[PDB]
Write a protein that binds this DNA or RNA. Structure first.
Lengths: 927, 366, 219, 366
DNA sequence: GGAGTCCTTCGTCCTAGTACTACTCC
DNA sequence: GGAGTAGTACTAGGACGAAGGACTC
């Protein structure tokens, strides 16, 4: 009628992962290029590209119609899995669909993926309209058997639960038994008075995409194209057929096309996106506001007694902090955040109560004195002129993101706390992905095309390391790519294929990157993904999408190294009773230690965080940083721009008096910029210096100052012109010369291009100083901890030892009997190998060994060892390495008698194990 | 080389010599046959370095001497498959040995005799002959107690103790020990020798039950056995064997006899409801009465009650049933006698009417 | 009558043209008629026209100075052409040999079209890869797989591999064949969207149109 | 619930019912038997989830009806183990089955009848009797050609074809195919049902060869087979048995006769030196002569020359010696007749005395 | 922009099932 | 000597552990 006579109601993107080929946007743009007004995307058990779908619908004037296709389990067909298409007509259906997906994953599944019981449609019912699944449906399969009674039993369920909302699916794609099914479906349709709908079961845009999709499937499944066992359920006719093509396919049943238009009108779901459903919580009978005010004033009292332990000084220095505190508090309260603050501060405190030092990341959160006051952060922001408005800007009415992270080791403990807090199902982890990037797609297509390991790896190692790498980029950057393409038929066939599959979605997404918090059940907002046992739920929307749909997130950051410090602190604080020393609080340290700076000026900063690069040690040597400010600077200094624009040499020279310091420039300086530019010797280095200069020189608000830095990033024509005027008359209003103000603005804007976030650098630099103090203040557990952290890396272990050696460290080989979990220092024995230090050995076997050593005494001999510990724990492979490492040297003086005796003794011991277990008294003496 | 021989002379030897040879040996020539013609004699030798087998067949038909080494398995299959009464003519021709019979003609690749490890000459130390039938008894009645793949390499075999005119046999796994000793009527040196499991398996195997004397020569580190023109040499195995007088129960005070078949059919039955891993039964014995109970984790249960001749106190003891079933099967007698000591020690069990053989099976902790 | 061949040359170029600046040094070809090996070998050695590559030398041995007095491809051009014309050429690593073949053909300057126009060029590696996916399907691999010995052979060089390829060829194409096993006017319902459903539809399209600036349904 | 049966009434049933079991039966109740007592009828059950086996023994001694499901292997062995004329007394005590005989007592775990899977009732369409003997010969003679595990899972089994007065069986690998047609002595409606290999194995095992007729019923998706006291039920696999009429050789023009035993002896000998996997031996036929030759990978040659009745033109054909020995083993006769086409076609073989069976082994062309 | 979290695929090792051979029973 | 059952050998399948390319802010 209006224009449209047909819309496609069966189409998947590559995000179905079991099938689909084209990405989401391209699918939508084709539909629109075809001049159709609507289009169903019915991916398999997910709505992963729904945000993209709705954004493309809006953009193109296209109405999105919501659906999915399924694998079902009904009692009528037994174990055979059949297909279902489920449409949500409204928001009742949307919620039913969200619950259905969740229910499938909660049940668990096999290699076939998650499956539903047909009778879950009893509960998951209202506002939904159904298609049979085609030839591969409940009804289709029963029809193809020709069991009319079975067919009648099956439909009867949908006549009960879905009157006028259950459809016959119609498919003419010329594939085996579609005509036999169609014959039987037409009989059924007339016999039962039923409505029918035609679709094209779309998997691709054009018939030439078929080959690529064939290979896509094969890659996922792990089978080869020409494997006879490989399912061939699909045809080249599964492309985006036009209106007219479908009109001719079904010119005998006009109502079938027309019923697509009708169904499309009935399908209207609103999911509102791009606007916050914020999380939150109460406390006492007190406001959330007032709870924060209280805990922050009183948290500030602890920090004030740490910072100024003379109470006279605390009183005189106090006003500054209270005024900063209330200024921040006013923005926080007037924007309506305090639930968020409270959750996170509780979380940080709870992890301190339990044995968890807290993960280093804060985004630019070091700009918040409130974060610091609440023990969210670790650094005094007023000491280093750190700015809250970089982190939450009051003059901007938008996203707060406070971007909180934590240490890996303790993730399950935190997941647990937040399930106790909110409800396990009201909390969710968020998907991150797999798509098929350049190296992967090469290797995967290569194996499918039957190559040996060596052939394909010879190709993939020529694809550059870089994160964003594509085949097109690879071929321009690396001359060997064009060359092997033209010289090798196997490489040509491979890259032709890889070109069609470049960037394509590969499968289920690894875990989270960070974990999300709803105010109710997470399923109130989206369906999730869960593991093989339907556990560990993760959201089907990724990080950007899930938060754009309104929910706050909590990151993993496993800069793990916290674990090192933690372990080294435990080991140091044991040395308490040995010589009555108080336990150490890394947060309580002095910032000026000379041993620390001596070692740093010597460039011996391996395992000192971010300063481990050879280049960065070269820079430290030239720079000779002698104060904490310089340590904050090292991350800002180690960048290609600043070094190779003369800025690094200026900075180094102005630091040592070999170039005079100006505020900021020789000509264009003013002494009012000195407090802002002091820490950097008159060089404009930081984003927050930009902001301080606008406040002090030209009377900007801190939030208007942050808006200028943002505008300097974008570099737009009109934009600047206005701020350039505000900046002129603001300086004029403070009596500062206009030409000086503008000439300094030009320098600010030049250096704003490189300008790094000081609050983000400082939060991380604190952790570097911690690793620096710890290293020097005791190069003695630290080393052990370094090695523990990077147990995996053989190269680094070797490096670390060479560092030990050079230091006057060093260093003993293992002992199975005496060793602790990892490296340990007896007083005299500077160092003993950890057990975990052995390369091949798993964690389980290391514990096994030590466990046996615990229950028994120290292991006396080879034999003694074998008898106590079965082969399950310590494999022969394992045992071999142990001897070769020399953990055994004490027992087996000859590295080689015991090697020969191994196998026999192992078997002997077990024969012994089984004798113990059974059964049984033995006979004679012994050997 | 050229000769012709009669299927019938060669068939039983071929079976004797092939049958222990492992499908795929570690050193290929171990799968090949040493063939030697000298005089009117073909000597066949199959070995695995542990045991050595020589067979002779007299050549009445035209011949030319020489030696070769051909694949054992395939040669034996060829000869087994030959037609009834076949007189086969074989000839060395270049690098192939040609095998003829009737109109069938075969051609096998060949390794030279010179490549084959000639194992060592030794001088005989103790010498004797005995009926084939005694030897077979001695071995059959006892072989079931050996280990499989024991670290105590001297258990993987059978201990022979020779003193005066008696030979005694023993093999054991530390849970049961099995003895038979019988008078052989020849004065021997005093010496004990442990022969390897596979050696004893094959010696038993070739003991055609019949008339032929069996004559054996032992050296210090090898043993040789003659029956007819099958001539056997093996190395011996060394270790310092444990004392059978500590394994024999000291003075078993309590005595129990019962009908062997009834006993055995009942234990076969109790065995079915024993745990597969432990093979456990519990024995309750009281004056003139005997009770078997077993169990499994599945809590399936068996009970037998039987009347036995028993004088002594009640006693409770559990065993691994496999260990006793194995002795009851080897014991091919009608009546059995048990002489018991206590729950923590050896038990004596024996043919009520013979005492040539001795069995102790160790009890279990259930 | 079918021809089994693999032609060994003065080494290979891995990069660019694998045939550029290279020429034929040895031809080792075995003749197979009615799947029986006749022994009618054309096995000849050629003019190198260049240096033998150090790698090629180590592969099966052949010295440069040995192929100097030997005749050129021009002296056996028609000889070799009639030997393979109208017959089966299945070769290992076809890109290599075909590259050389057509190269020599163009060098004759008799406008003789490429070997693939008068001879059946088939790669054996492709077929083996198809049959045994994920297994090494090189000639030596398949040789060992079908229990063919290429180690205890007096024949060294091209003739070795030709022989082996013939056995492999016959094995794959003799593995075993098949029992070819068996190979109007009516009702039904039109479901009209109700007034409620129409209103939801209208509201949904309103959103599209108001926010995005078009509605294709009303265009 | 109680019953009393004599061991000897239960023995052959129990043995037969225990055959289908070994699958590591995963659904634990499959390791057990279904006992149904109702009336004075004890019913016996063996199932492998795909088929079902029923036996009745009459109960002459005191009994009480009811049902339970006892562990199969273990109960079979207990009963097989008991002496002849043993009084077996079964009785349900709540959640356990008590077995008493004499002085022995057993208490077994019991799972309830209602957990045991039941395959459905169906209705009969074709019904017939025949001597056991005929079904025995039929299966034994041809079973060797069935696939074990193939992609064409329907060939894991056999075509049953009834038509007129003929029973006609055939089975195949996709390499060789065995065919038999027999008169069955009753007019039969046309039906086809495809029984799994395990099915045919079990059917083989239930034939004692005796004179009780076998009577089978065939439904839409099932079959039931009655011999004497036992009743067998299996369900069928979906369909599409490929067309045997297509594979038949079209006028094999050469006639070749030779003694089955001689022939089989020569194949066995020649086979020792063929390709280990595919058993390739080569055949040259000419007037009155047959030369067999084979290759083994090590260049060794086994070869037979033989006196062969043959009229026709000279041709060569080789194929897999294992398959041809299998047919010579199924050919329980002195002489063979082979009818040929060519080196690249399917083959016909018959016994010169029975056209009852038809065989095809394919060539390889080397 | 770097590194860690992420799984998945490749290689190795052990365990379980199936087949064949050899011994004991019929 | 042949058939039935046990024992041994070989094959098949699954799990574990070390490696690698990738997508997170």
């Amino acid at each position: 009628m209006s224009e449209p006579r047909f819309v496609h109601l069966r189409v998947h993107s590559d995000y179905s992962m079991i099938d689909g080929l084209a990405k989401t946007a391209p699918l939508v743009k084709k539909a629109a290029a075809l001049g159709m007004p609507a289009l169903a995307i019915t991916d398999f058990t997910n709505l992963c590209g729904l945000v993209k779908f709705y954004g493309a619908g809006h953009g193109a004037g296209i109405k999105p119609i919501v659906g999915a296709d399924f694998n079902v389990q009904c009692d009528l067909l037994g174990d055979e899995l059949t297909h279902l298409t489920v449409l949500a007509a409204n928001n009742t259906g949307y919620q039913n669909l969200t619950l259905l997906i969740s229910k499938a994953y909660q049940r668990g599944y096999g290699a076939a993926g998650p499956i539903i019981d047909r009778d879950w449609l009893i509960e998951l019912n209202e506002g939904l309209i159904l298609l049979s699944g085609g030839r591969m449906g409940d009804v289709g399969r029963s029809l193809l058997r020709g069991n009319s009674a079975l067919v009648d039993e099956c439909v009867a369920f949908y006549e009960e639960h879905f009157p006028d909302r259950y459809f016959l699916e119609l498919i003419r794609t010329g594939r085996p038994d579609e005509e036999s099914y169609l014959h039987a479906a037409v009989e059924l349709a007339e016999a039962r008075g039923l409505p029918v709908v035609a679709t094209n079961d779309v998997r691709f845009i054009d018939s030439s995409d078929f080959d690529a999709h064939e290979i896509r499937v094969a890659i996922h499944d792990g089978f080869t194209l020409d494997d006879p066992k490989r399912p061939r359920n699909y045809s080249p006719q599964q492309y985006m057929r036009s209106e007219e093509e479908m009109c001719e396919l079904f010119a005998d049943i006009p109502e079938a096309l027309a019923n697509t238009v009708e169904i499309a009108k009935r399908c209207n779901v609103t999911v509102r996106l791009g606007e916050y459903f914020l999380p939150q919580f109460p406390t006492g009978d007190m406001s959330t506001e007032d709870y924060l005010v209280k805990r922050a004033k009183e948290g500030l009292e602890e920090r004030l007694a740490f910072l100024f332990p003379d109470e006279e000084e605390r009183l005189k220095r106090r006003p500054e902090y209270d005024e900063r505190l209330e200024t921040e508090l006013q923005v926080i309260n007037q924007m309506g955040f305090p639930g968020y603050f409270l959750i996170v501060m509780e979380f940080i405190q709870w992890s301190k109560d339990n044995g968890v030092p807290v993960g280093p990341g804060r985004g630019s959160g070091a700009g918040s004195l409130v974060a610091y006051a609440l023990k969210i952060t670790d650094l005094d922001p007023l000491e280093f002129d750190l700015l809250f408005e970089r982190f939450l800007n009051p003059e901007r009415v938008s996203m707060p993101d406070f971007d909180v992270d934590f240490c890996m080791e303790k993730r399950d403990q935190v997941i647990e706390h937040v399930a106790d807090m909110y409800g396990r199902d009201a909390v969710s982890q968020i998907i991150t992905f797999g798509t098929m990037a350049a190296k992967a797609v090469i290797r995967d297509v290569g194996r499918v095309l039957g190559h040996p390991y060596g052939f394909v790896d010879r190709i993939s190692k020529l694809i550059p390391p870089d994160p964003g790498m594509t085949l097109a980029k690879a071929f321009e950057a690396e001359p060997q790519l064009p060359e092997i393409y033209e010289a090798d038929e196997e490489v040509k066939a491979l890259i032709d294929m890889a070109r069609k599959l470049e960037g394509v979605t590969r499968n289920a997404g690894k875990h989270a990157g960070g974990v999300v918090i709803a105010p109710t059940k997470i399923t109130d907002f989206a369906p999730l993904y869960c593991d093989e046992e339907g556990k560990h739920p993760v959201t089907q929307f990724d990080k950007s999408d899930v938060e754009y749909a309104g929910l706050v997130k909590f990151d993993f950051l496993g800069l793990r190294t916290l674990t090192i410090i933690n372990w080294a602190l435990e080991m140091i604080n044991k040395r308490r009773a040995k010589n009555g020393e108080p336990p150490l609080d890394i947060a309580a340290i002095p910032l000026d230690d000379k041993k620390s700076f001596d070692m740093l000026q010597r460039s011996e900063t391996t395992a000192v965080f971010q300063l481990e690069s050879r280049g960065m040690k070269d820079l430290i040597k030239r720079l000779q940083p002698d104060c904490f400010e310089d340590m904050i600077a090292l991350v800002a200094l180690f960048r290609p721009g600043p070094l190779q624009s003369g800025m690094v040499d200026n900075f180094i020279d102005r630091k040592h008096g070999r170039e005079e310091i100006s505020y900021p420039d020789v000509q264009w300086q003013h002494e009012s910029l000195k407090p802002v530019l002091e820490p950097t010797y008159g060089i404009i280095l930081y984003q927050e210096q930009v902001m301080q200069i606008a406040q002090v020189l030209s009377g900007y608000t801190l939030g208007g100052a942050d808006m200028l830095r943002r505008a300097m990033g974008k570099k737009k024509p009109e934009e600047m012109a206005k701020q350039r005027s505000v900046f002129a008359e603001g300086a004029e209003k403070n009596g500062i010369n206009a030409e000086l103000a503008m000439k300094i603005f030009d320098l600010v804007e030049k250096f704003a291009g490189y300008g790094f976030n000081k609050s983000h650098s400082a939060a991380y630099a604190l952790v570097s100083y911690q690793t620096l103090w710890l290293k020097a203040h005791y190069p003695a557990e630290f080393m052990a901890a370094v090695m523990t952290a990077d147990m995996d890396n053989t190269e680094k272990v070797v490096g670390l030892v060479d560092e030990c050696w050079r230091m006057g460290l060093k260093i003993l080989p293992p002992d199975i009997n005496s060793g602790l979990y990892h490296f340990h220092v007896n007083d005299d024995g500077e160092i003993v190998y950890g057990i975990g230090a052995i390369k091949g050995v798993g964690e389980g076997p290391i514990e096994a060994i030590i466990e046996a050593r615990n229950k028994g005494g120290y292991f006396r001999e080879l034999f003694d060892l074998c008898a106590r510990t079965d082969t399950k724990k310590l494999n022969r492979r394992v045992l071999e390495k142990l001897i070769m490492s020399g953990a055994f040297d004490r027992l087996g003086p000859h590295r080689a008698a015991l090697m020969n005796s191994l196998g026999d003794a192992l078997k002997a011991a077990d024969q012994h194990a089984k004798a113990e277990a059974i059964g049984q008294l033995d006979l004679f003496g012994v050997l | 080389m050229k000769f012709t021989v009669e299927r019938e002379h060669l068939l039983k030897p071929l079976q004797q010599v092939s049958g222990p040879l492992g499908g795929r040996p570690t050193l290929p020539i171990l799968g090949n046959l040493l063939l030697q013609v000298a005089d009117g004699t073909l000597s066949l030798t199959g070995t695995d370095l542990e045991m050595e087998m020589v067979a002779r067949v007299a050549l009445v038909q035209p011949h030319e001497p020489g030696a070769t080494t051909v694949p054992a398995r395939k040669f034996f299959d060829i000869c087994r498959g030959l037609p009834e009464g076949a007189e086969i003519a074989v000839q060395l021709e270049g690098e192939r040995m040609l095998v003829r019979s009737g109109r069938s003609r075969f051609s096998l690749s060949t390794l030279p005799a010179a490549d084959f490890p000639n194992l060592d000459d030794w001088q005989s130390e103790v010498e004797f002959t005995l009926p084939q039938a005694t030897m077979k008894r001695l071995i059959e009645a006892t072989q079931f107690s050996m280990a499989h793949q024991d670290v105590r390499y001297y258990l993987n075999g059978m201990l022979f103790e020779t003193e005066g005119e008696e030979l005694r046999t023993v093999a054991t796994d530390g849970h049961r020990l099995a003895v038979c000793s019988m008078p052989i009527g020849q004065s021997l040196p005093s010496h004990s020798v442990i022969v390897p499991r596979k050696g004893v398996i094959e010696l038993m195997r070739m003991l055609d039950g019949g008339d032929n004397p069996l004559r054996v020569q032992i050296g210090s580190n090898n043993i040789r056995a003659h029956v007819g023109d099958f001539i056997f040499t093996s190395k011996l195995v060394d270790g310092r064997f444990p004392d059978y007088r500590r394994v024999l129960p000291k003075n078993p005070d309590k005595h129990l006899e019962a009908g062997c078949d009834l006993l055995k059919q009942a234990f076969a039955r109790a065995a079915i409801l024993s745990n597969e891993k432990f093979r456990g039964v519990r024995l309750y014995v009281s004056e003139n009465q005997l009770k078997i109970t077993a169990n499994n984790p599945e809590q399936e249960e068996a009970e037998e009650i039987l009347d036995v001749t028993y004088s002594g106190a009640e006693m409770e003891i559990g065993f691994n049933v496999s260990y006793v079933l194995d002795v009851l099967n080897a014991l091919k007698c009608e009546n059995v006698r048990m002489m018991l000591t206590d729950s923590v020690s050896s038990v004596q069990i024996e043919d009520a009417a013979s005492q040539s053989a001795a069995y102790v099976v160790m009890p279990m902790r259930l | 009558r079918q021809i089994v061949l693999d032609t060994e040359t003065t080494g290979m170029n891995q990069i660019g043209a694998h045939y550029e600046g290279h020429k034929i040094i040895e031809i080792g070809a075995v003749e197979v008629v009615n799947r029986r090996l006749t022994g009618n070998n054309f096995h000849v050695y050629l003019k190198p026209d260049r240096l033998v590559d150090p790698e090629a030398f180590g592969v099966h041995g052949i010295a440069d100075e040995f192929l100097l007095d030997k005749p050129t491809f021009a002296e056996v051009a028609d000889e070799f052409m009639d030997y393979i014309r109208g017959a089966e050429l299945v070769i290992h690593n076809a890109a290599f040999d075909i590259g050389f073949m057509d190269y020599e053909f163009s060098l004759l300057k008799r406008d003789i079209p490429k070997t693939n126009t008068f001879c059946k060029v088939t790669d054996s590696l492709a077929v083996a890869r198809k049959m045994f996916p994920g297994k090494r399907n090189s000639l030596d691999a398949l040789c060992a797989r079908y229990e063919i010995d290429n180690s205890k052979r007096t024949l060294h060089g091209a003739l070795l591999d030709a022989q082996i390829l013939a056995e492999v060829y016959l094995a794959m194409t003799g593995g075993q064949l098949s029992l070819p096993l068996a190979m109007q006017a009516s009702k039904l319902r039109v479901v009209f969207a109700t007034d409620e459903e129409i209103a939801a539809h209208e509201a949904r399209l309103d959103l599209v149109q108001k926010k995005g600036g078009s509605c294709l349904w009303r265009a």
